[model samples]
Target: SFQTQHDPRTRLGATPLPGGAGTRFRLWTSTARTVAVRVNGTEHVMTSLGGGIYELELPVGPGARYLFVLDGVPTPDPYARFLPDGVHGEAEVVDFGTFDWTDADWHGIKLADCVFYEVHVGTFTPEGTYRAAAEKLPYLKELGVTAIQVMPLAAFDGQRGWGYDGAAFYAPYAPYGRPEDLMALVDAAHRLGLGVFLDVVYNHFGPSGNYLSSYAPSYFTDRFSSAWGMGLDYAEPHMRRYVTGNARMWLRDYHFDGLRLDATPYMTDDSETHILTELAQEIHELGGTHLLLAEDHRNLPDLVTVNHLDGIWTDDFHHETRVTLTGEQEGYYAGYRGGAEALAYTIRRGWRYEGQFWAVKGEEHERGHPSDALEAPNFVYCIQNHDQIGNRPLGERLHQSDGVTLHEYRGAAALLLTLPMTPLLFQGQEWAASTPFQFFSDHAGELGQAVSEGRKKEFDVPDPQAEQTFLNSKLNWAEREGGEHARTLRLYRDLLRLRREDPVLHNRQRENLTTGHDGDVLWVRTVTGAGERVLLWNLGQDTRAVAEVKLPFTVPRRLLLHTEGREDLTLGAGEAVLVG
Candidate 1:
C-alpha cells in the first residue's frame, strides 16, 4: 500500500545508470556560462538544459572521482552522494541500490512514545565513525531510549567538530566512513527497535568548502539578513528545490525515521508557500510514520498545528531548571527566575513565555507566541543538550558546576524523565559523563587560526583547533559502571520504565494535569480515566525540613518512586517523589 514519490537522485547529483551502462551527471547554475564534468583527467562538455541546469551522460560509474569545471574553476558537486576526498576535493558517485538493507519492516516509533537520545558521532565514541557508534546501540536500547537524534551528518570541512557546520548537503561527512557504513548503522538501530533521526542544518552553510554560490549566484540572496550573513534564496524555484530535495533524500534514500531542523527562524522565504510548509508537505506525501521536529526559538504553535511538524524543542523547562539548580542569573538565564513557582508554571503550561517580553544580557524582545492549543507531546524537553554544555566558557556540564549539589541534580533528573512531554537525553547524560563536550574543529590554515583566536577572544577556553580539544571531548565509557554515574543511570532506567508502565503517566493528556507550588515545594498531579499520579519536588537547602503541600485529592496514595529512596510520602529538602 506504499506509493513511491519522486526520487531526488534521478533529477539531481550523479546517478549511475542501470546495469553499469554509465552515469548521468547534473548541475544547476545561474552564474556559470560554461560547465564541464571532469573524470579520469578527461573533460566532458555538458549541454545546457535551458533553466540554468547542465547535464552530461558519461561512461563514469560508481567509485569514479570527479569534479565540475565551472568557468575554468574546479568545484565539488553540491549534490554529491559520497565525498571520498572530503568537501574540497573531488566527489565520488554512489550506487544506492548496491547496499543491503534489512529494515523493510521497520515502520517507525510514534512521536509521543519516543525518548530521544541526542548523539554527536565524533564524541560518542573514540573511533568517531558511524560504524563505531553502531556497536554501542545495545547500550542505548538497554537505557530505554526509543530513538537516537543524531547530530548533523552532512559533509563538513574537517574530521573533528560538531556536524552543524556541514557544507555539502547530500553527502555524508567523509571522516564518518562511507554512505554504506551509515546505512549499516541505521539498519543496526532498526534491528534493535531504535528509531534513528538526523539533525539537519538548513539555515546556513559553513564558512568553508561551500561551493553553492560558485555554481549559482542565485543560491544566496542579500535581501534577507541572518546570523550567518546572507540568507538562502528560497524564493528562487531551483533554490527551494535544492533544500527540499536534500530533505527528501535523507528520508527516501537513507531511511531516517525523522529530522530535527536546526534554527528554523533563519530559514526565511518570501514565496507564497513558505519553504517549511513545502518541506513538510513533501515528506508527509511520502507516507508512513515519519516524524519532523524543529528547534525553533520562536515558540509559535503554528509550527506544529499549521506547518505539520510534530514537535518543537522547548527551552523554558531546561532554563528554569538550570537556574533553580545553579542560582546563576547572568546572560540567557537573566530572563528566568528559577523557583518552585517557575517549575510549576512550566509543568502546567508547556512554555513559560507566551508572547511575553523577556530580556537577555540587556537586550529586550517579545519572545514566543501563545502555544495554549498545542499538546504536551508537541514540546520536546531536555535538561542538557550539546549547545547548553559546549557553548559555555569551559564546556562544563551541570554536574561540574559548583552551584548545583548532587542531591539537587538527582531531583532535577526525576522531573525531566517523568514530564508529560517527550524527553530527550543528551549522550552520556544517563550516566552523568565526566568528560566535557567542548567546541573543537580541525579546519586547517588561516581558518584554523581564525577559529582559535575567536574562541580565545570570548573566553580562555581550550583551543578549539587543537587535536587535544577534540580528544578531550570523547565520552569515557568506563565511568558508567561505577559510583554516582551508575546510580544516575539506575534513576533514569527506573523513571523510563515507570513512564512506560504507568497508564496515567503514559497517557500524556495535558488537560488531566494540574500543577501548583508553595515556596520551595512544587507538586504536579495527573488524573485521567486510566489512573492518577502525583509528583512532589522540594528544592530547598535545609535537609531536615519537610515539604508541606496541599494535595488535589484527599485519597492517600502509595509512593511509586523517590530520589531519596524513601518509602513514605514525606518530601525532604532537595528530594523529588512520585506517588499513585
Candidate 2:
C-alpha cells in the first residue's frame, strides 16, 4: 500500500512499465537536436514528444545499464535513479517495487516534537555505508533524538566529500551502498519510530560531473550569481519541474519525512508563483505529515508564516552563544559581542539580528528582519553544525576550543534542549567524540589539486584530497562509553528525556514564557497548564545567588536537574539548573 501511493518510477528517467511490459526512457532537453537511449549497448532512437521532451520504450528490466546519446556524445540521465558507476558512468535502471519496505504504519513526527541529530553519512560509521548506519538506529533511538537529519545523499563528484556538490539530483551516492540499502535504513528508522529528514542542495551544481549544460544550456541563467556559480533558472518551466520533482522524489519514492533546503538565499526565482511556495504546496498535497525547513541567513519570518515552510535554521543563537563561549569576534562574529543580554534576547525572541547594522570584514551591512511573531518551533538552533565546523581550517568542534570548560558546554547544551525552539545536534556531539569533520573531497586531476591547493593557501590545513583527511573524520564510536565522553552523553540523554517528558519544557509557547538576565546569570521561566518551571543558567566566571536574579514571576524553589549535580540555590559559574 505504501509503495502503491508513493511510487515515482512512472515519472522520469528509465521507468519500468506497469505489469511486466517494458521500460520507458525519457529525457527533457531543449537544445539537443537528436536524442537516443542506449540500453546495455543497444542504441534506440527516441520519439520526439515536442516541448523539449523525448521518449523511448524498450523490453528491458531492472539492472540494465543505460545512457542517453545527445547528438554524438553519451550523457548520463539527469533524473537517473541510480548511478552505480559514479557521475560519469551509465545510469542503472531501478525498480522501486523490488525492495520490501515495512513503514506502512509510520505516519511521521511533528516538527515541534522533533529532536534533530544531524549526520554526515560518509563519516557516520567506520564502513560509511547505509547498512552500517542502519545498524546504529537503536543507539540513536536510545539517545532520545526523535529524528535524524541526514546530510545530502545526492550523487556528488567524489566518494569522500560533503554532498553539497551533488550532480545527479535523484540518485543516492553509490559509495554508501545501493538504493535498497538506503530504503532499508529508512525502514529501520521508521520501525524505531524515528523520523528521517534529508538535506538537499538546489542552489548550484558542483564543478564537475554536471552534464545539464550539455543537453540544455538554458538550465542555468546569468541573471544572478550564486556563491558556488550560476544560479538555477527556476523561471523556466522545465527547470522548475526538475527541481520540484526532485523534492517530490525524495518524499514520495524514498519515503523521507522531511527535506532541509541548503542555502535558499541563492535559489532566486522570478516566476509569478515562487518556487519555494509551489514546491511546498505540491509536497503538502501529497497528504501526509512532512516538515520543510530552510537554511537561509535572511532571517525572514515569512518563510514560515507565508512560505508554507515549517521552520528555518536560526544562526543567531549559535553565533552569540559561540562568541560568549570562545570570545572570538572576527569575520561574521564581529557584530556579536556575546553576553547574558544577547543570550537573553535570543531566548525571548527567535533571533538576535533584527534589521541591525552588522559590520563584517570592515564593511557595515543591514542584516535580518524582525522574527518576533514566529513561533519558537519555527526556528532550529544549534551550537555546532556542518558549516560552522567544516568551514574552519582544522574543523575543530566546540569542545576542542581552548579555555572552554566542560561546565559551560554542559550549560549551553541544557539551554538548547530545554528551549522552546527546535534543537539540532551534530554527529558525535552527544559524546564529545574527538574526531575532526574536516572538509575532504575525491575530485580527480586538476580540480582535486586546485581544491587542495586553495585550502593550503587560505589556511595551513591538511590536504582535502588526501585519503587521511577523510579517514580521520570518521567517528571513534568507542569513546562514547568512557570518561568525560560518557558523562557528556549521559547529560544529553537526561536533558533530552526531560525535554520530551516534562510538559512545561515540551510546551512551545513564546507568549507564555519570560526571560531575564542579571549580570552574567540568565533565567527563563515558563507557565503551562501542567505546571511552572524555571531554568537558571550562569555564564559568568564567578558563582552568583539565584535569588538575586530578577524575574517577572516567582522563582521555583524545588530543584529538578542541575548541570553540576548540585541542589543548592547558588548558581555556580558556567552551570545551569532546572527548577519547579
Candidate 3:
C-alpha cells in the first residue's frame, strides 16, 4: 500500500519530517482490524488509511521506544529501524539525521574494473566489531583492493556466525556495535578510497526470530520453499516494498556503494515486473553508479543484460579450475573433470557446460549459458571464497590442501589476477592465511543442537556449537610475516599491482581474448593496442614442455611474470609463465 500518488506522508515506521514536524508513523497489516502505537506507556489509535495501511502523526524523537498493538496484542513494527532489545522485543525510534555522514564527496567506484575483498567483520580481526574492523582500513587499502564487500550485518539471533541467518532487515546487528558504528566503518572505508558493498539476503528470513508470518502470513509463500526456510512472498505488494526499500536504504542511508544480492535465483518472484528488475531500476534511480551483483548459481546470463544486474559471482570458472588443479572429481566436481580443455573453454566462453547434459543430478536441465555480448568484466571470479573453503568437510583452503602444491596455488593466483573478469579475494586469502573458515553458529536452545546434528550429517565437520570452532576461524595476522606467507602476500600484491599497471590487463575487455590448452597446459592470450600477452600455465604434475605452440600474435615473446618466482621463460611443473 505504498502508494505512488505523490503522498509525502506514506512511509513505513518512524520517518522524521522536515523542519522539526515530528515523525510520520505508518504500518501495513491486512490481518489487524485495529492498530495502535504505544509509546511511553501511551496508546494512540492509528488512522486506517484503507487497504490495511495505518497512518499516525507522532512527535516521537530518537531513542523513543514503541510497540505496535494489533487489535490489543502488542507487536513490533515490521519495518522497525532499530530493535533496542532483541528481534522479539520492542522497536526503537531512530533518527538517521543524527548520524554525522562525512562522505558527501565520496562517490563509489565501478565494480567492473574493481578488485573486491570479501570480509566477514566478526573474524576479520581479533576484536570483532565495526570499530575494530575500521581500524584495519589502512591495511586493506595497502592490499590493493578497490572495494570491500562485507558479509551481512543485519540483526541475527546471537552475537556471531556467518550473517546469513539475519532476521531483522532494518536493524544492524547490535553485537557488532551501534548502527552508527557500521556507518562509521563505511565512512572510514570511503575516506580511505575503498568502496563498501554489503551482501544482502532477501530470499528468506531467519527461522526463529521472524515475526512477519505472525502479522502477515502473505509475507511468505507456501508454494516456494528455500533450503533456509519459506521463500519470500514477492507477489505481495508490501513484501516487495520490504525488499526493494531495503536495497535502496543501504545505498542511501549507510552509503554502501553496491549490493551483492544473496541467492538471486531463489527469489522466485512471479510478478510481471520481476523483483530483480525493479531493484535494479530503483538502485539506478537512487542517483549513483551503484552495482548489483547477483549471487545466482542458475548460470543465466540474462540476469546481467535482461534483468540489469551488474554482474554475477561466476562459479563455473572456479569449479573448472578447482577440478583441474586439485584432480578430485566428486559430486558436482564430476561435471568439471574435463581438465585443461574445460578450463580453456570457461576462460574464453564464460561457462564450461552451457546447456549440456548433466550426470550429476541425473536430469535434463537448461540452467546456464553466457550471452554472446556479455563482457568478461561482468563476471566476478575467485579462486577461494567462504563457500569454497567452509563447505568442504575439513574446511581446507586451496593453499592448505595437502593435494595441492605451492606452485599450483601460485599459478591459480596468477590466472585469477590476470583474467579479464572482476576478481574477488576472501579476507586473508592474499596472505595465504592459515585460518580455516569453518561454519560456526550460535543458535540458542534446541535449534542449536539440530543445526549441529544436521551439519554433522551433511559433512565431516567439527561441532558448530563449539566455541573453539569460531576461534579457529580467526585470522592470525602475525602469520603473514613469516615463511611462505610473506612471499605469497607479495605475489598477490605484485600481481594486483601489475593488473593495474599493465596496459593489456588494465584494458579490461574480453572481446580480444581467447584461450586454448595443450595437454596438461593452458594458454590465455589477450591482444591489446600494444601487443599480445599470453599466459602459459601448467595444470599437470610432471615437468612437461611444449616445443612449439601456436600464437595469437606472431611476435617474439618475452617473460612478463612467472608463478614459480623465476625470471626464466621455461615453465616448471604446476607453474605459470606470462609472455608478451
Model 3 C-alpha lDDT per residue in residues 1-580, reported as the tens digit of each score: 2222113367687778778777778887879888898986799999988878888887777777888898898887767877867777777777777889888888889876689999988899898889999998999888788899999877777658888888888888777877789899999998898999999999888866677765778888889897767779889977887888888888888899999999887889889989998888878877788999999877788898889998989788888888887777766877777566778888787766566666776644665664466788788999898889888877779978767888888889999999889999999988889889988888899989999999888854778877888889998999999888888898888888888888888756778888887787888888879777888888877765534544444533677788767856667888888778
Candidate lDDT values, in order: 0.85, 0.87, 0.82
Ranking by TM-score: 2, 1, 3
lDDT of 1 by residue, 1-580 (tens): 3233346444777988876788999988888878999986788899998878788888888898899999988889898888888889899988888888999888998889999999999889989999999999998988889999999999988777798778899999988889999999999999999999999988898877788888887888998865545688888877787877888888878899999999998888877878888888878777767889999878789998877899998888999999988889778899898999888997777998888888785668888887788898999999899898998878888888877766677788888888889999899988888998899988878988988999999775799999999998899999999999999889888988888888888867688888887678877888888877777788876643233465556523678899868766676668888888
Per-prediction tally of clashes: 0, 0, 0
The alpha-carbon deviation from the true structure for residue 162 of candidate 3, after best TM-score superposition, in angstroms, is: 0.9
Worst 10 residues of 2 by lDDT: 1-10
The residue pairs that clash in candidate 3, if any, are none
- Lowest summed-lDDT stretch of 10 residues in model 3? 1-10
Q: TM-score, each model? A: 0.96, 0.97, 0.95
lDDT of candidate 2 over 262-322, digit per residue (tens): 9988889878878888778878877889889999998898888778899999999999999
